[PDB]
Design a binder for this molecule. Structure first.
Ligand SMILES: CCCCCCCCCCCCCCCCCC(=O)OC[C@H](COP(=O)([O-])OCC(O)COP(=O)([O-])OC[C@@H](COC(=O)CCCCCCCCCCCCCCCCC)OC(=O)CCCCCCCCCCCCCCCCC)OC(=O)CCCCCCCCCCCCCCCCC
Ligand SMILES: CCCCCCCCCCCCCCCCCC(=O)OC[C@H](COP(=O)([O-])OCC(O)COP(=O)([O-])OC[C@@H](COC(=O)CCCCCCCCCCCCCCCCC)OC(=O)CCCCCCCCCCCCCCCCC)OC(=O)CCCCCCCCCCCCCCCCC
Ligand SMILES: CCCCCCCCCCCCCCCCCC(=O)OC[C@H](COP(=O)([O-])OCC(O)COP(=O)([O-])OC[C@@H](COC(=O)CCCCCCCCCCCCCCCCC)OC(=O)CCCCCCCCCCCCCCCCC)OC(=O)CCCCCCCCCCCCCCCCC
Ligand SMILES: CCCCCCCCCCCCCCCCCC(=O)OC[C@H](COP(=O)([O-])OCC(O)COP(=O)([O-])OC[C@@H](COC(=O)CCCCCCCCCCCCCCCCC)OC(=O)CCCCCCCCCCCCCCCCC)OC(=O)CCCCCCCCCCCCCCCCC
Ligand SMILES: CCCCCCCCCCCCCCCCCC(=O)OC[C@H](COP(=O)([O-])OCC(O)COP(=O)([O-])OC[C@@H](COC(=O)CCCCCCCCCCCCCCCCC)OC(=O)CCCCCCCCCCCCCCCCC)OC(=O)CCCCCCCCCCCCCCCCC
Ligand SMILES: C[C@@H]1CC[C@@]2(OC1)O[C@H]1C[C@H]3[C@@H]4CC=C5C[C@@H](OCCC(CO[C@H]6O[C@H](CO)[C@@H](O[C@H]7O[C@H](CO)[C@@H](O)[C@H](O)[C@H]7O)[C@H](O)[C@H]6O)CO[C@H]6O[C@H](CO)[C@@H](O[C@H]7O[C@H](CO)[C@@H](O)[C@H](O)[C@H]7O)[C@H](O)[C@H]6O)CC[C@]5(C)[C@H]4CC[C@]3(C)[C@H]1[C@@H]2C
Ligand SMILES: CCCCCCCCCCCCO[C@@H]1O[C@H](CO)[C@@H](O[C@H]2O[C@H](CO)[C@@H](O)[C@H](O)[C@H]2O)[C@H](O)[C@H]1O
Lengths: 87, 53, 383, 57, 106
């Protein structure tokens, strides 16, 4: 698996944060570091506890590609700049 | 005679069913998009800019 | 909309004819407003004529009260027609922008000329009279709609976020109304479901307590110039006057069912002045009629019965919700097959990353078991 | 460059969760409004009885 | 007994019942792998809810039209014991008519 980063956490433990409910909980009882579902989320205990997620090779049943009509929204405006372009 | 009586219900019901199908399709599209985003997230190749876009 | 040379040439060519037309419209609108003001002063309620004071409960700052300082003249049709009211409203907008420009010119002498060049290069703040043909008018309307799109979402988000962060609805119906109020224009909102939000927000905030920033956003969304904004009771007065005229015209139309007999272009303009029908949507008569009927239903029977409209803040949010287009999404789904962090592949994994992968990877259970067993053995040996 | 981006990033999860819940609520409301309309039609036995009476039987 | 023929209605869109059924089958066929069964008392999924709504509408339309296929009607429309009663009543009626026609012919 790659060395790429993931959704940022800010060095916070999601099992005790004020918005913990927004983070899904897996079978082991460890809330995810991101809105996505994570099976191998863990918690490390330094002076402060922090959540971590290790990327891994996992296969997920991929729903077939829909049509562009049902997910594309051509409401773009001259002032609008996408996050990728901004980055 | 019965067919004539049970007609407006039928046409309106058919139109409502078509509208319901068109309403459900975008939900499945969003679900597929989220599936792909999660797939890339688990691989550690997802940027927050892509997710927001 | 951004400025352009073509629009600059258009406005420069039509500058003097536009000024002459504006002067003629000024005379006509002065006559209409004289009639309306005389009628208001003669038949208006005592509180409305005397300008009753309504102070806030926290800082005791006066502001217009929707119930007292706003009055619907049910019998205005005798003296003034609907078309005259619409003309007066359009002239009010144009006169506001022209007055701001003239004030700038007077203040800065001859140094406003380059700023005037910037002004004429864009149709956002030029009067409607500067357009002498259909295409020019269409472009001007497009610019106004673009400004409305640019401004309205901020106002809606301000209102929704403040309410949701500092309060919650009382009952389920209020919850549904609040949630459905701020839906995107791509879906149709039922006014009956949405109406209770008016009472809820009246419980939260009335038009007399509207904050200055929210007022600025609203005035931006109504194509009302905001610089110099000054105190909140000036643009607030402008908004009150505009919506009072709109309510009078709406009562006239509802009572006389003028919209059914109203032609397509006039109906589109009537909806547009209510911020219901953007021109870029290319709406047909059916959609315009549906939106107008929804607006009338939202006003509610009490509007006809007593001339009392729902909370003005919620009404503005509801009408401007038609300019809250769905968030744009461009690009084929296949783009999701790419990777974002390929440039890091050359760096590989360091010792800490390798340790994390080993501990939290597929072998995590084995490592955890081994570590726990070793720790237990060491603890037992220590004891 | 630094502050507003960080706070937007902090906002993202809660907003995503709330919007998912809202979509689920919409689907639930769509489902809850579905009722099967069982209609009742005049029994043909009465029609047969009327036919017999018309025959003068 | 019924009254007046109901006022005429104009369709907003043109589409056949067969085309709608085919579109529904195509939509539900792509999610078969993703679709997961569960206990009746357990919460339902988005796919299950969509399937139930679509099939309920389709089979209500079919039963109103005259295509009395009890096997699927009892599945995609029965959610109240009332509906089971209605299915049983309709099942007896169809069989009774078939037998009556056969003997009246014989
Ligand atoms: C280059 C140019 C430079 C210019 C410099 C000059 C200053 C700037 C000029 C103007 C700039 C434009 C914007 C101005 C602000 C606009 C505010 C606004 O939106 O108002 C809307 C508002 C309209 O809304 P509305 O609904 O119609 O009515 C308001 C509601 O009542 C509202 O209802 P409410 O519920 O809010 O009611 C409360 C309301 C009630 O008030 C009002 O709204 C009523 C109107 C104001 C009344 C003010 C006078 C009060 C009585 C004064 C008595 C003095 C007696 C002294 C006797 C001395 C004897 C020796 O507010 C108050 O209570 C405030 C009262 C004022 C308190 C003043 C405290 C000062 C403390 C001083 C500390 C010490 C200073 C240093 C030491 C000095 C001594 C050594 O406008 C007004 O009411 C009046 C606006 C007037 C604008 C200012 C005009 C400027 C004229 C300048 C002439 C001189 C030029 C010199 C040039 C020099 C060379 C360059
Ligand atoms: C030469 C000296 C210069 C001194 C320095 C000046 C520096 C520049 C400052 C600005 C000056 C004014 C600029 C022209 C504005 C146009 C006239 C006007 O008021 O338009 C109506 C309009 C009124 O707005 P509104 O919100 O609808 O009014 C609400 C009221 O309830 C409305 O009441 P309503 O609901 O009952 O409706 C009434 C409406 C009903 O009528 C209609 O609907 C018919 C239309 C009437 C208005 C037509 C306006 C047309 C504007 C465009 C003109 C053409 C421009 C062409 C440009 C290109 C040229 C090549 O009729 C009115 O609009 C009447 C308004 C009241 C009269 C205000 C004028 C007072 C000053 C003039 C008399 C001065 C006497 C001096 C005596 C000296 C003794 C020693 O004006 C505005 O849009 C407001 C001005 C916006 C810019 C504000 C900038 C800050 C000002 C701060 C001033 C502070 C004091 C001064 C010291 C400053 C130190 C920093
Ligand atoms: C003939 C004509 C007919 C007759 C006349 C009629 C009357 C005409 C006048 C009235 C017109 C009114 C309407 C105007 C609309 C257009 C306004 C405008 O400008 O729009 C932006 C306009 C573009 O508008 P747009 O593209 O249409 O987009 C409009 C959108 O809707 C975007 O809209 P937005 O809303 O987003 O944009 C708004 C934006 C507007 O602002 C901007 O967009 C910024 C514009 C400047 C950007 C500059 C960027 C580039 C910088 C370059 C630096 C130098 C580079 C190196 C040069 C090397 C040269 C060798 O922000 C603001 O509104 C901020 C307002 C700030 C107010 C400031 C108030 C200060 C008060 C002070 C405190 C006082 C407190 C009280 C104290 C009391 C004490 C007693 O900007 C430009 O075109 C940029 C021009 C840049 C020029 C070159 C750089 C500067 C050159 C300076 C030369 C100096 C020479 C002398 C030097 C001497 C040295 C000794
Ligand atoms: C990385 C570095 C980059 C470079 C950085 C450069 C360094 C910057 C460092 C400092 C920056 C911050 C400074 C802040 C200062 C404090 C500001 C403050 O306290 O404001 C409170 C407060 C905030 O304003 P606001 O109304 O609440 O909302 C402001 C928003 O921006 C309104 O936004 P909105 O969205 O609500 O409305 C948007 C739209 C809405 O649309 C409209 O409103 C329609 C169009 C309106 C047109 C204007 C109407 C004006 C009517 C008359 C105003 C009263 C005049 C008073 C008498 C004259 C006094 C001079 O309005 C506009 O588009 C406004 C366009 C204005 C364009 C001009 C902007 C300045 C560009 C530079 C030009 C001057 C360069 C001079 C130096 C160089 C000389 C060689 O200010 C006011 O109440 C405004 C009073 C304005 C009085 C006139 C200006 C006085 C200042 C001196 C002028 C000197 C002129 C010299 C001419 C040339 C001589 C050679
Ligand atoms: C490049 C740099 C060049 C050099 C620059 C030099 C800079 C000097 C630094 C010192 C300046 C300090 C003052 C800053 C003013 C801006 C403050 C501000 O924006 O606050 C935002 C503040 C925050 O509001 P928010 O948080 O959104 O909402 C809170 C509330 O909901 C809001 O709700 P609300 O609006 O209902 O409540 C507010 C309202 C509520 O009340 C009302 O509505 C009633 C209005 C009553 C008006 C009473 C006027 C009385 C005048 C008497 C005159 C008698 C005649 C005398 C004739 C002979 C002598 C001349 O009351 C007022 O705000 C009005 C108060 C009285 C205004 C007096 C006129 C301005 C004086 C400015 C100079 C002060 C001394 C400076 C030196 C010392 C500095 C430490 O909003 C306001 O205050 C809005 C109104 C702003 C009006 C002032 C600005 C007008 C434009 C100025 C035009 C002249 C430009 C000259 C340029 C010179 C360039 C060199
Ligand atoms: C912030 C920046 C600063 C710099 C700047 O941009 C903004 O400031 C801006 C301010 C600009 C001036 C503004 C106004 C004029 C007058 C005009 O005049 C018309 C022709 C006739 C008058 O019609 C001229 O005839 C006069 O008639 C008068 C009697 O009526 C006589 O008295 C006077 O002697 C006689 O010449 C000729 C152009 C000029 C000078 C502008 C030049 C460019 C600027 C310096 C800009 C420039 C780019
Ligand atoms: C530089 C200043 C620029 C100012 C620009 C704006 C000017 C506006 C002028 C408006 C004039 C209206 O004219 C005025 O109307 C009012 C209201 O109908 C009349 O008012 C009359 O009827 C009312 C209502 O029954 C009575 O309360 C009042 O006692 C009586 O006089 C005045 O007799 C008339 O003179």
């Amino acid at each position: 698996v790659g060395n790429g980063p993931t959704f940022s956490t800010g060095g916070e433990c999601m099992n005790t944060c004020d918005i913990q409910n927004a983070f899904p909980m897996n079978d082991r009882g460890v809330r995810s570091s991101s809105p996505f579902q994570e099976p191998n989320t863990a918690i490390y205990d330094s002076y402060l506890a922090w959540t971590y997620f290790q990327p891994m090779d996992v296969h997920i049943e991929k729903l077939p590609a829909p049509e562009a009509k049902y997910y594309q929204r051509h409401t773009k405006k001259p002032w609008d700049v996408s996050s990728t372009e901004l980055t | 005679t019965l067919q004539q009586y049970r007609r407006a219900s039928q046409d309106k019901r058919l139109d409502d069913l078509v509208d319901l199908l068109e309403r459900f399709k975008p939900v499945l599209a969003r679900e597929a998009i989220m599936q792909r985003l999660t797939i890339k997230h688990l691989e550690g190749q997802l940027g927050v800019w892509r997710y927001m876009d | 909309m951004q400025g352009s040379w073509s629009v600059l040439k258009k406005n420069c060519s039509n500058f003097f004819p536009g000024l002459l037309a504006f002067a003629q419209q000024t005379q006509e609108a002065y006559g209409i407003w004289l009639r309306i003001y005389n009628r208001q002063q003669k038949y208006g309620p005592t509180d409305f004529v005397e300008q009753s004071e309504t102070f806030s409960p926290d800082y005791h700052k006066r502001f217009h009260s929707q119930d007292k300082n706003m009055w619907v003249d049910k019998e205005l049709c005798t003296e003034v027609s609907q078309k005259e009211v619409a003309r007066l409203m359009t002239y009010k907008l144009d006169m506001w922008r022209m007055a701001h420009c003239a004030g700038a010119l007077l203040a800065t002498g001859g140094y406003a000329i380059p700023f005037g060049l910037f002004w004429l290069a864009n149709d956002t703040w030029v009067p409607s009279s500067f357009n002498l043909t259909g295409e020019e008018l269409r472009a001007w309307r497009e610019a106004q709609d673009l400004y409305r799109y640019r401004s309205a979402p901020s106002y809606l988000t301000d209102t929704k976020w403040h309410f949701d962060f500092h309060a919650y609805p009382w009952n389920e119906t209020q919850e549904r109304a609040w949630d459905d109020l701020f839906e995107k224009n791509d879906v149709r909102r039922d006014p009956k479901v949405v109406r209770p939000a008016a009472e809820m927000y009246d419980g939260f905030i009335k038009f007399e307590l509207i904050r200055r920033k929210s007022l600025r956003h609203l005035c931006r969304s109504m194509n009302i110039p905001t610089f110099p904004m000054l105190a909140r009771l000036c643009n607030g007065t402008r908004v009150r006057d505009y919506w009072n005229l709109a309510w009078c015209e709406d009562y006239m139309v509802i009572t006389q069912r003028l919209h059914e007999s109203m032609t397509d272009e006039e109906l589109y303009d009537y909806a547009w002045r209510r911020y219901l029908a953007p021109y870029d949507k290319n709406l047909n008569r059916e959609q315009l009629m549906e939106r107008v009927e929804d607006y009338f239903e939202f006003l509610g029977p009490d509007f006809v019965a007593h001339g009392k409209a729902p909370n003005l803040v919620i009404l503005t949010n509801y009408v401007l919700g038609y300019y809250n287009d769905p968030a744009y999404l461009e690009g084929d789904i296949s783009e999701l097959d790419k990777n974002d962090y390929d440039h890091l592949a050359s760096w590989g994994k360091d010792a800490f990353l390798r340790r994390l992968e080993f501990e939290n990877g597929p072998l995590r259970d084995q490592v955890e078991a081994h570590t726990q067993r070793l720790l237990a053995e060491r603890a037992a040996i220590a004891k | 460059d630094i502050m507003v981006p960080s706070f937007v990033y902090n906002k993202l999860p809660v907003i995503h969760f709330l919007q998912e819940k809202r979509a689920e609520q919409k689907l639930r409301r769509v489902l809850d409004e579905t009722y099967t309309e069982w209609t009742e039609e005049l029994d043909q036995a009465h029609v047969t009885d009327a036919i017999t009476r018309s025959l003068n039987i | 007994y019924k009254g007046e023929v109901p006022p005429h209605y104009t369709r907003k869109s043109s589409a056949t019942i067969e085309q709608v059924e085919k579109e529904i089958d195509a939509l539900l066929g792509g999610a078969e792998k993703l679709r997961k069964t569960s206990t009746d008392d357990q919460p339902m999924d988005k796919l299950t809810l969509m399937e139930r709504c679509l099939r309920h509408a389709l089979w209500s339309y079919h039963k109103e039209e005259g295509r009395y296929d009890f096997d699927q009607i009892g599945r995609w429309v029965v959610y109240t014991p009332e509906d089971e009663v209605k299915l049983a009543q309709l099942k007896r009626e169809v069989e009774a008519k078939e037998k009556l026609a056969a003997l009246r012919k014989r």
